[PDB]
Design a protein around this ligand. Structure first.
Ligand code: ADP
Lengths: 238, 250, 232, 240, 134, 146, 139, 240, 228
């Protein structure tokens, strides 16, 4: 396996296995589904931990007023680009006194992750960010990958068996652009709970919720904030 | 890109730096030097590498170089790789004169060169110095100071030193003729002459194929004396002649 | 760039440098070269022959003097020859700034071999296969010096380099005795050029520089045909 | 003969041979370009051909010839990736020459720079050795004609009849006994032998649009890029 | 088995009335004993046929195949470049076989300016490493 | 054949191929009974084999795609019963580097746990487990993400 | 190798099979296996675990009194002269080998046997030791 | 072994497979083309849709450099944005020192310096991205150029990239380089790209358009696909 | 196959870091407990010889006033992280005038946990146990060498880690008090200690809002030993 040595050397097929190996850790993360309607957007993630008494590590965390995000991959490099994201948030908040459209900002994140892919001894960064953002043109949902290829979508997912969520999404998600905030939230768990193994919850502290819009400011929702989201539904038929 | 260097700095499965062994072999190949006991003087002896008689030899001393007016050093190893250390230590002893305006005791000077000799060893996988050199001179405190440099970083200084695999047979002769003051500079001349007679395989011990130097303490001269070949000819001839009188035990 | 600069050429189990052994092999497979220090000045001859008739000696030269009073010859590749010559011309100013006087012969050999020996311990490549012959005239007695890749230099009256450097030198040992003159040095230079000839006695197949106590003199092949036509 | 990474980098073999730049000698054959140069008494000629994949090939980007200054010009062989960058380095050396020195460049010192540049890149194997072959002409006073060729080996040599490339071994070997002898060189005489040497390997006698042929004579020292009209006039002039 | 081949030509005998013709992959491994005249009398070989000579190599390919009368020989010669007689022919017939896949009988060079072009491009992928010592 | 000696045993048996060539090149009679060849890889061989007489058609078979990848095991699992919901896109979307033969074994271990489950029929939750069950690698640990 | 051999793997596997046959499947047979090499490096480290797992003997170099304990066993048979002493010689000498300290007596077994004498002389044994000293020094 | 590993180390064939590995990596990309008439330069790209995958209009391979110059890329998408942004901001340097439009022929020299240098150093690698460069102006004219991972600066009147390339640009010769009007050639090339680059393998796809030329007065933007729907207004009847 | 030391794994993750995660298993055993009255903790000194001096070996250190920390596996690298983070706690007191919160020690350490790189240098094998009491009451925190932070009511490291936590899962509950946490933990400690229990085998580390610091004092631990 001498052709997989470094990111510099290309595979016999003209590929780099280092990026493919970083895609693994992205898929090894928790199942998280961000989504957006024509008006407002909601993103849902999954908290996990090691032992029973160990507190579930939070995934969704606030970045900017209009920017919510999910997370996965190495938490050290996640906080590295998280504080770097704060440096990007203070850019236009200082100079222009108004926030940044996220499209060109994620493109700068791609150029930020381009240098570690090129030079020798530099490694990519596993990133599970699902970025929701609002400029005056409406919502944006961007997936993140070590290859820095972002898709603007109405919804997507990254994690374990996250494709089965999309298969349940398409015919439903076409009608999910019309619905308002509340049901647009539990449509996120209408993905996660299928991506979760059927033999266990789906508890209160293992789920992450956030909501953001053009006229709405983003906030982290967990524990008591999940009370209206859990009630009003039924268990999956066996 | 990590597989190109041979990891000369990095430790070896043998429990020690592996390149230092081949370094001691570099000095331990073709290098021939020695030292003589110091009583109101000292002398030096080495082997002249040049076997060609057509050479000019206009540089005076060949293998011995003068670092300071009252202090010099013998050297064994690669020529230019040693010549880098000649001017380097000469400048280190010069920056000390640039500091105190006063000569340099050899102690802190040798340890300074040892801290420089470990540079190639301790970083970058650099090739360690393939040169191990001797030390001679005089100071206000201990008088005549005769030291020795080692590739491992130690100063192995003795008043009687050995350099080279062929000179390793002289250590038994050094302790067989060993005395202290007692020994005259002339006695050390015949001592080192019999050292070459036992070690060097040159028939009759040709005087022009080996280098000899001396040193004296004079007020305030303290001259490091390069000698003409006339006194060395008659010295080795008078030496083996005294050996012809030393075989009378039969 | 990378900037590794590691020492990768290392000691052999015998203690020597196998790469420098490959360097002296490039010198041993080098072009025949000789020079003679006798009496008033030094004479340089060696050989230059083109791969075909398409080339001439009137433009590109294998022998470029370092100074007006100091000439130089060598063995091995030309590209690295002009590289160390370029550094020799630059280093000549570092000397001339302080001294404001011309330079002794051995003064170049000290600093050139120091940079050459530095280029051994330094990363990248090594002194390669270029073994330079430095000559000149100072203090009334001229000099002829030659170093090696490892930086070891020696002084003598005459030597042979390149291919058959041992055979040509053993011929120069019997021919050269006591002292010689410039005309006699050129004469036995034709003898050592006729050793590997090839192109001896012909003006276009060799180039002859000569050092003198009045300063180095580089004569065109015209004078090479003058003295030797009529050779010997 | 090889110790460790020796085969993949530049050091000296037991015989002292370089493994990497000997691959650069066969790096010229990419594209199959053959450039021949014939320098006459008062003139110097360059001749090279091209390959056309289809009609979409642009006529403006056809030219493989480069022009150093208004007086002097160049021609490259081998892979075009190393040639375009090495020519831009010649633009930098010529512009800096006129700037600081402020007089005409002999074209000999330019070939000295490129010879050392390709050598310095041959020194350290961690950057590409740049095995492209550098061929120029020259115009200088009192020296008559000037032609210099900087080889990827790091040295510069050039004369009346000199060429480099894949098939130049055949043609120039014919040019050994063909050129001299005594043969005098005029404009149409140097261009004729520039066609005949191409007629040794090829002998296609194709229309002038395919060849890239530079020529420089000393009346007005400025070199001019040739138009297919005058070459067509020379093509009907070489048919007897 | 080589020693006799030598000695048979090393005679002691005159074989002149027999004409020994020799061809193989490469003229390299034969060892110098064969490589001298006598055993190897002359040096003859083949190179890539010129497109001018390939213009004729297609005629003897285009002769046995009849089609609609639309032809430009230099078209395939200028499009398809640097080939061999069999390599051209077989693919030229393969083009006719690739074009007759449409079940129509006569085929203009259109398919052939495509097939022979595209098919030999696949065939020139394995043209790699075909250049052997003399 | 290697190229230079010494020596290969098949270097003599290459002549069987050279005679196979000599029968398809220097000899007519090979015209009938069309012959086909196959390898795991085309990597290094006698490259002169290009011709109609010697090998001609070169068809690179890539990794089976989601068209086949969904259908291959579908025709491999048509032998066996299915709880009548299976995406077949699930695999086909998540199939990367998966060979057409691996898909044959995907339904095996999926059916093997269905065996030891005592189950009557195979379901997608049992199917999709067999995807990551056969490939790739691991076990190692799941941690610091969970 | 002598004669003809190759490549590495066939020599690697004949050692790999040497252990794998000795592994073994499934052999009680003893033949208690003693194995040695003075260079611990080159062996594949996997040879230890199947066997022998518990033992690889470390050979210490001889110390001063070990050389004393070893030496007299040889010269027990060879009669020493009056001035001959075991200690002082090997006391001054350093880093010897049991073979040498055994073979240093053979040099006196020449000259004394050249004179055909049953007795060792230290005047020679000192002076002749230089030859074995020259044997270790220069050889 | 492994002569292809480092980019600064040659191979016995005289090249580096890192460039070759990057070449055939671009072959897996979808259609990337360009064509220039007298009135402008037409650009188009075929988007491959794996499943949904996302909203329409996101992360298109069509990029932009200046008002008169734009990018149509191929290969890896991130490094395409990289070299696109490098050439994007590079025009600001020419605009700062001078203030007029950057010539496209000498703008490709910059990307030639970047890609070639990345092939020079052993630490970094070559970029596996190719692209097309085209433009038109009243004081300049139509110039189309093509750059590949090998760092070759060259151009044609029309060119193609991706799986179907030589077969796609063959019938393009029917469309003239001058006499044709690129306004109508929009749908003329649309019928080629719709028929060529066979979609039977992957049924889900999408098509993008752009243009630059005199009709927009040296402005490079997307000729509207939602207006007149020129893409499929014709090509639906071209394959039947 | 050693490649770049930074190379990922095909599973996958960082090679060298995960190897050091397994290296944590040979460290000393330490168990913290979160209790409303205060956050306690203890460690086994692992006496290597009867000559050992008791006060020279301590596996628990004090970062801020009310913030403690523990070490695992390799020591000196963690000991550097200790005082280097204390500089950031003093810089926290610079602008904010008050004591650093126990949760912010994560951002003060785990952010800089692994900065290592070949250019501009090697990872760590030590996991830290962060004790303390912030404005919200008692908090027990733990971080790994890779920088991943998690809040645990009880956390064990080193050798007994998996075994101690598996046994302590039953005895822990939300109503656990301080004195009960100390005497119920030493039952596990006396099970996970090889040497006979004495004053030099184990030390106590506690933090309380009203009693401090404390830490803990000697000769009182012997009073708890007779309460075994
Ligand atoms: N007078 C000659 N001198 C040298 N070689 C000759 C002479 N006559 C013929 N030969 C060559 O010698 C070859 C036969 O020589 P022979 O000694 O039989 O071969 P081998 O030395 O291989 O046994 C012929 O091919 C011929 O070209």
């Amino acid at each position: 396996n001498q052709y997989d040595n470094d990111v510099t050397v290309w595979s016999p097929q003209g590929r780099i296995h280092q990026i493919e190996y970083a895609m693994e850790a992205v898929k090894q993360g928790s199942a998280t589904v961000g989504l957006k309607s024509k008006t407002h957007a909601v993103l849902v993630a999954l908290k996990r931990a090691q032992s029973e008494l160990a507190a579930h590590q939070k995934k969704i965390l606030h970045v900017d007023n209009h920017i919510g995000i999910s997370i996965a991959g190495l938490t050290a490099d996640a906080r590295l680009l998280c504080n770097f994201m704060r440096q990007e948030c203070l850019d236009s908040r200082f100079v222009f006194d108004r926030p940044l459209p996220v499209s060109r900002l994620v493109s700068l994140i791609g150029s930020k992750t381009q240098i570690p892919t090129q030079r020798y001894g530099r490694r990519p960064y596993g990133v599970g960010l699902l970025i929701a953002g609002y400029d005056d043109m409406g919502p944006h949902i961007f997936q993140t990958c070590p290859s820095a290829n972002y898709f603007d979508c109405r919804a997507m997912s990254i994690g374990a068996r996250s494709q089965s969520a999309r298969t349940y999404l398409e015919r439903h998600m076409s009608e999910f652009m019309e619905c308002n905030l509340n049901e647009l939230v539990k449509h996120g768990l209408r993905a996660l709970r299928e991506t979760l193994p059927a033999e266990q919850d789906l508890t209160t502290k293992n789920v992450s919720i956030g909501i953001v819009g053009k006229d709405l400011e983003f906030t982290i929702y967990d524990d008591d904030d999940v009370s209206p989201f859990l009630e009003g539904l039924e268990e999956r038929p066996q | 890109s990590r597989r190109y260097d041979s990891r000369t700095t990095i430790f070896s499965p043998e429990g020690r730096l592996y390149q230092v062994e081949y370094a001691m072999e570099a000095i331990g190949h073709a290098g021939t030097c020695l030292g003589i006991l110091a009583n109101d003087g000292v002398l030096l002896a080495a082997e002249r590498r040049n076997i060609h008689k057509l050479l000019d030899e206009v540089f005076f001393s060949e293998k011995i170089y003068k670092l300071n007016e009252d202090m010099a050093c013998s050297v064994a190893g690669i020529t230019s790789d040693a010549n880098v250390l000649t001017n380097e230590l000469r400048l280190i002893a010069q920056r000390y004169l640039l500091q105190y305006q006063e000569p340099i005791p050899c102690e802190q000077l040798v340890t300074a060169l040892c801290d420089i000799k470990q540079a190639y060893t301790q970083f970058g996988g650099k090739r360690p110095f393939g040169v191990s050199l001797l030390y001679i001179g005089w100071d206000k405190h201990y008088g005549f100071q005769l030291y020795q440099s080692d590739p491992s970083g130690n100063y192995g200084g003795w008043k009687a030193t050995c350099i080279g695999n062929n000179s390793a047979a002289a250590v038994s002769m050094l302790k067989q003729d060993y005395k202290e003051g007692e020994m005259t500079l002339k006695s050390a001349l015949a001592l080192a002459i019999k050292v070459l007679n036992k070690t060097m395989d040159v028939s009759k011990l040709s005087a022009e194929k080996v280098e000899i130097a001396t040193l004296t303490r004079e007020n305030g001269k303290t001259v490091i004396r390069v000698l003409k070949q006339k006194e060395v000819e008659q010295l080795i001839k008078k030496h083996e002649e005294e050996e012809a009188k030393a075989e009378r035990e039969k | 760039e990378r900037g590794y600069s590691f020492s990768l050429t290392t000691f052999s189990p015998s203690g020597k440098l196998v790469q420098i052994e490959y360097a002296l092999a490039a010198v041993a497979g080098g072009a025949p070269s000789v020079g003679i220090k006798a009496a008033n000045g030094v004479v340089l001859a060696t050989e230059k022959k083109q791969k075909s008739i398409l080339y001439d000696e009137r433009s590109v030269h294998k022998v470029e003097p370092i100074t007006k009073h100091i000439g130089l010859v060598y063995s091995g590749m030309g590209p690295d020859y002009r590289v160390l010559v370029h550094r020799a011309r630059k280093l000549a100013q570092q000397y001339y700034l302080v001294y404001q006087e011309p330079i002794p012969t051995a003064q170049l050999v000290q600093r050139v071999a120091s940079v050459m020996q530095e280029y051994t311990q330094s990363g990248g490549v090594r002194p390669f296969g270029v073994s330079l012959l430095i000559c000149g005239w100072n203090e009334g007695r001229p000099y002829l010096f030659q170093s090696d890749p490892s930086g070891a230099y020696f002084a003598w009256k005459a030597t042979a380099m390149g291919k058959n450097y041992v055979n040509g030198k053993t011929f120069l040992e019997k021919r050269y005795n006591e002292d010689l003159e410039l005309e006699d040095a050129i004469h036995t230079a034709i003898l050592t050029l006729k050793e590997s000839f090839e192109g001896q006695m012909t003006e276009d197949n060799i180039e002859v520089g000569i050092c003198n106590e009045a300063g180095f003199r580089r004569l065109t092949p015209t004078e090479v045909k003058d003295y030797l036509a009529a050779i010997a | 003969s090889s110790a460790g990474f020796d085969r993949h980098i530049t050091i000296f073999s037991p015989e002292g041979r370089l493994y990497q730049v000997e691959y650069a000698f066969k790096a010229i054959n990419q594209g199959g370009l053959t450039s021949v140069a014939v320098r006459g008494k008062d003139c110097a000629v360059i001749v090279t051909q091209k390959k056309v994949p289809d009609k979409l090939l642009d006529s403006s980007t056809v030219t493989h010839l480069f022009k150093i200054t208004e007086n002097i010009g160049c021609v490259m062989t081998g892979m075009t990736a190393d040639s375009r960058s090495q020519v831009q380095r010649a633009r930098y050396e010529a512009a800096n020459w006129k700037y600081k020195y402020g007089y005409e460049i002999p074209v000999d010192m330019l070939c000295k720079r490129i010879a050392d540049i390709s050598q310095v890149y041959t020194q350290n194997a961690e950057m590409r050795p740049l095995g492209c072959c550098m061929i120029l002409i020259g115009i200088d006073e009192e020296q008559g004609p000037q032609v210099y060729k900087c080889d990827p080996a790091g040295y510069y040599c050039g004369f009346k009849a000199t060429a480099a490339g894949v098939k130049q071994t055949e043609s120039t070997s014919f040019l050994e006994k063909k050129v001299k002898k005594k043969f005098d060189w005029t404009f149409e005489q140097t261009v004729e032998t520039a066609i005949t040497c191409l007629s040794t390997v090829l002998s296609i006698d194709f229309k002038p649009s395919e060849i890239e042929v530079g020529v420089v004579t000393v009346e007005n020292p400025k070199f001019r890029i040739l138009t297919e009209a005058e070459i067509d006039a020379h093509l009907v002039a070489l048919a007897e | 088995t080589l020693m006799e081949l030598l000695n048979q030509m090393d005679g002691f005998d005159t074989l002149h009335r027999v004409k020994m013709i020799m061809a193989t992959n490469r003229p390299d491994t034969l060892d110098p004993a064969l490589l001298r005249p006598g055993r190897l009398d002359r040096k003859i070989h083949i190179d890539l046929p010129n497109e001018q000579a390939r213009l004729d190599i297609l005629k003897i390919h285009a002769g046995p195949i009849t089609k609609h009368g639309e032809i430009d020989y230099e078209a395939i010669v200028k499009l398809s470049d640097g080939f061999n007689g069999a390599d051209l022919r077989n693919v030229c017939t393969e083009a006719g076989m690739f074009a007759i896949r449409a079940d129509h009988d006569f085929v203009v060079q259109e398919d052939f300016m495509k097939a022979v072009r595209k098919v030999a491009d696949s065939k020139k992928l394995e043209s790699k490493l075909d250049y052997k010592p003399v | 054949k290697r190229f230079d000696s010494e020596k290969a045993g098949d270097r003599e048996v290459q002549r069987t191929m050279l005679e196979l060539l000599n029968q398809l090149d220097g000899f007519q009679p090979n015209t009938q009974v069309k012959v086909i060849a196959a390898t795991n890889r085309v990597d290094i061989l006698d490259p002169a084999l290009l011709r109609s007489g010697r090998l001609d058609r070169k068809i690179e078979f890539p990794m089976p795609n989601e068209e086949a990848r969904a259908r291959i095991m579908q025709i491999h699992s048509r032998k066996m019963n299915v709880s009548p919901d299976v995406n077949y896109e699930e695999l086909a979307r998540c199939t990367d580097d998966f060979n057409g033969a691996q898909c044959k074994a995907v339904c095996v271990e999926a059916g093997m746990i269905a065996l030891r489950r005592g189950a009557t029929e195979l379901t997608h939750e049992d199917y999709m487990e067999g995807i990551l069950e056969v490939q790739a690698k691991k076990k190692a640990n799941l941690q610091y993400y969970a | 190798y002598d004669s003809n051999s190759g490549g590495e793997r066939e020599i690697q596997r004949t050692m790999l099979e040497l252990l794998n046959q000795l592994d073994g499947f499934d052999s009680r047979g003893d033949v208690k296996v003693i194995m040695a090499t003075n260079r611990i490096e080159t062996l594949d480290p996997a040879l230890i675990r199947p066997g022998r797992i518990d033992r690889k003997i470390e050979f210490p170099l001889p110390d001063e009194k070990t050389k004393k304990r070893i030496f007299q066993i040889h010269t027990s048979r060879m009669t020493l002269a009056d001035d001959v002493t075991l200690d002082d010689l090997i006391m001054a000498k350093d880093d010897l080998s049991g073979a040498d300290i055994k073979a240093i007596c053979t040099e006196a077994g020449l000259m004394a046997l050249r004179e055909r004498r049953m007795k060792v002389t230290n005047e020679d044994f000192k002076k002749s030791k230089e030859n074995v000293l020259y044997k270790k020094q220069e050889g | 072994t492994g002569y292809d590993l480092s980019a600064s180390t040659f191979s016995p064939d005289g090249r580096v497979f890192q460039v070759e590995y990057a070449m055939k990596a671009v072959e897996n990309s979808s259609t990337a083309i360009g064509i220039r008439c007298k009135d402008g330069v037409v650009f188009g790209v075929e988007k491959l849709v794996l499943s949904k995958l996302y909203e329409e209009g996101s992360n298109k391979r069509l990029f932009n450099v200046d008002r008169h110059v734009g990018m149509a890329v191929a290969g890896l998408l991130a490094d395409a944005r990289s070299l696109a942004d490098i050439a994007r901001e590079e025009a600001s340097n020419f605009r700062s020192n001078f203030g007029y439009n950057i010539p496209l022929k000498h703008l490709a020299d910059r990307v030639a310096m970047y890609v070639h240098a990345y092939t020079l150093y052993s630490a970094v690698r070559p970029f596996g991205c190719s692209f097309m460069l085209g433009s038109y102006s009243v004081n300049d004219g139509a110039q189309l150029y093509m750059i590949d991972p090998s760092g070759v600066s060259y151009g044609y009147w029309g060119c193609a990239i991706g799986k179907a390339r030589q077969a796609a640009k063959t019938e393009i010769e029917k469309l003239q380089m001058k006499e044709m009007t690129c306004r109508d050639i929009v749908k003329e090339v649309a019928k080629i790209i719709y028929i060529v680059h066979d979609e039977v393998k992957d049924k889900a796809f999408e098509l993008e358009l752009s243009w630059v030329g005199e009709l927009t007065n040296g402005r490079h933007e997307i000729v509207p696909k939602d207006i007149r729907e020129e893409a499929e207004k014709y090509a639906k009847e071209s394959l039947k | 196959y050693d490649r770049g030391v930074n190379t990922f794994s095909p599973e996958g993750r960082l090679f060298q870091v995960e190897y050091a995660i397994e290296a944590i298993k040979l460290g000393s055993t330490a168990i913290g407990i979160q209790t409303s009255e205060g956050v306690c903790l203890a460690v086994e000194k692992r006496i290597t010889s009867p000559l050992m001096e008791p006060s020279s070996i301590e596996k628990i250190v004090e970062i801020d006033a009310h913030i403690g920390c523990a070490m695992s596996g390799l020591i000196a690298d963690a000991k550097t992280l200790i005082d280097k983070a204390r500089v950031e706690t003093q810089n926290h007191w610079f602008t904010y005038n008050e004591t650093m919160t126990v949760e912010s020690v994560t951002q003060a350490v785990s952010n800089l946990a692994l900065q290592f790189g070949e250019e501009d240098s090697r990872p760590f094998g030590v996991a830290l146990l962060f004790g303390g009491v912030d404005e919200k009451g008692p908090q027990l925190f733990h971080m790994d060498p890779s920088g991943t932070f998690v809040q645990c009511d009880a956390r064990a490291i080193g050798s007994a880690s998996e075994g101690a936590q598996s046994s302590l899962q039953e005895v822990y509950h939300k109503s656990m008090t301080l004195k009960e946490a100390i005497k119920s933990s030493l039952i596990i400690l006396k099970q996970v200690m090889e040497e006979k229990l004495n004053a030099t085998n184990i030390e106590l580390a506690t933090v309380q809002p009203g009693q401090n610091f404390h830490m803990f004092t000697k000769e009182e631990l012997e009073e708890v030993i007779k309460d075994i």
